[PDB]
From a paper:
In meiosis, ploidy reduction is driven by a complex series of DNA breakage and recombination events between homologous chromosomes, orchestrated by meiotic HORMA domain proteins (HORMADs). Meiotic HORMADs possess a central chromatin binding region (CBR) whose architecture varies across eukaryotic groups. Here, we determine high-resolution crystal structures of the meiotic HORMAD CBR from two diverged aquatic Holozoa, Schistosoma mansoni and Patiria miniata, which reveal tightly associated plant homeodomain (PHD) and winged helix-turn-helix (wHTH) domains. Our data reveal how meiotic HORMADs with PHD–wHTH CBRs can bind chromatin and potentially discriminate between chromatin states to drive meiotic recombination to specific chromosomal regions.
To determine these proteins’ structures and mechanisms of chromatin binding, we expressed and purified the Hop1 CBRs of two diverged aquatic Holozoa: Schistosoma mansoni (blood fluke) and P. miniata (star fish). We crystallized and determined high-resolution x-ray crystal structures of both proteins using single-wavelength anomalous diffraction (SAD) methods with the anomalous diffraction of endogenously bound Zn2+ ions. The structures show CBRs with PHD and wHTH domain tightly packed on one another in an overall configuration similar to that of the budding yeast Hop1 CBR, but lacking the HTH-C extension seen in that protein. Within the CBR, the N-terminal PHD shows two highly conserved zinc coordination sites, one with three cysteines and one histidine (S. mansoni Hop1 residues C284, C286, H306, and C309) and the second with four cysteines (S. mansoni Hop1 C298, C301, C324, and C327). The S. mansoni and P. miniata Hop1 CBRs are 43% identical at the amino acid level, and are nearly identical in structure, with an overall Cɑ root mean squared displacement (r.m.s.d.) of 1.4 Å over 136 residues. Structure-similarity searches using DALI and Foldseek revealed that the S. mansoni and P. miniata Hop1 CBR wHTH domains are more structurally similar to canonical DNA binding wHTH domains than to the budding yeast Hop1 CBR, which binds DNA in a noncanonical manner. We detected DNA binding by both S. mansoni and P. miniata Hop1 CBRs (Kd = 16 μM for both). Mutation of arginine residues in each protein’s predicted DNA binding surface (R389 and R407 for S. mansoni; R463, R477, and R463 for P. miniata) to alanine resulted in a complete loss of DNA binding. Overall, these data show that in contrast to budding yeast Hop1 CBRs, S. mansoni and P. miniata Hop1 CBRs bind DNA via a canonical wHTH-DNA binding interface. We were unable to perform the same analysis with the S. mansoni Hop1 CBR because of poor solubility of the aromatic cage mutant (W304A; not shown).
Author numbering: 280 to 430
Write the structure that this text describes.
């Protein structure tokens, strides 16, 4: 059993999806999948989509938004998706909590925290210094559909 995911953190968290091409697991949210019903019949990771494109013509589905990005741009997108999903299940966050939860370095977590402020997902002081409260309804009803809609 192996996790191999372009967020760069090769550890199970949340809903995991199996690539039909390499038999490694990715975080569903990294691949733009939040609801279990949006898990494809045959998931294809970003590596297999480029090594074996026939997988995509014979029933497989990749996340076309990250497939051809650079390593660094893809990692930043996937990690931000993970932090959005974390916020869906929490009342407040901080860089340190983000770092622990996602398995990443503090400085990277702080960048994700800062982007949450810009996307207006967090606002208002939490109980502890450095924490901000999640705008729960705004996240669920408005922000999340910007990133995770399948229509
Ligand atoms: Zn991931
Ligand atoms: Zn694969």
């Amino acid at each position: 059993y192996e996790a191999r995911c372009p967020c760069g953190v090769n550890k199970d968290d949340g809903v995991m999806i199996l690539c039909d091409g390499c038999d490694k697991w990715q975080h569903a949210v990294c691949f733009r999948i939040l609801q279990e019903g949006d898990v494809p019949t045959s998931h294809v990771c970003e590596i297999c989509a480029k090594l074996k494109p026939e997988l995509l013509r014979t029933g497989g589905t990749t996340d076309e938004t990250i497939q051809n990005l650079s390593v660094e741009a893809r990692k930043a997108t996937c990690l931000f998706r993970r932090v959005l999903a974390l916020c869906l299940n929490e009342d407040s966050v901080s860089p340190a909590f983000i770092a622990r939860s996602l398995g990443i370095e503090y400085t990277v977590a702080r960048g994700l925290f800062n982007r949450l402020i810009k996307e207006q997902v967090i606002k208002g002081a939490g109980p502890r210094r450095g924490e901000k409260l999640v705008e729960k309804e705004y996240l669920e009803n408005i922000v999340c559909p910007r990133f995770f809609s399948h229509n």
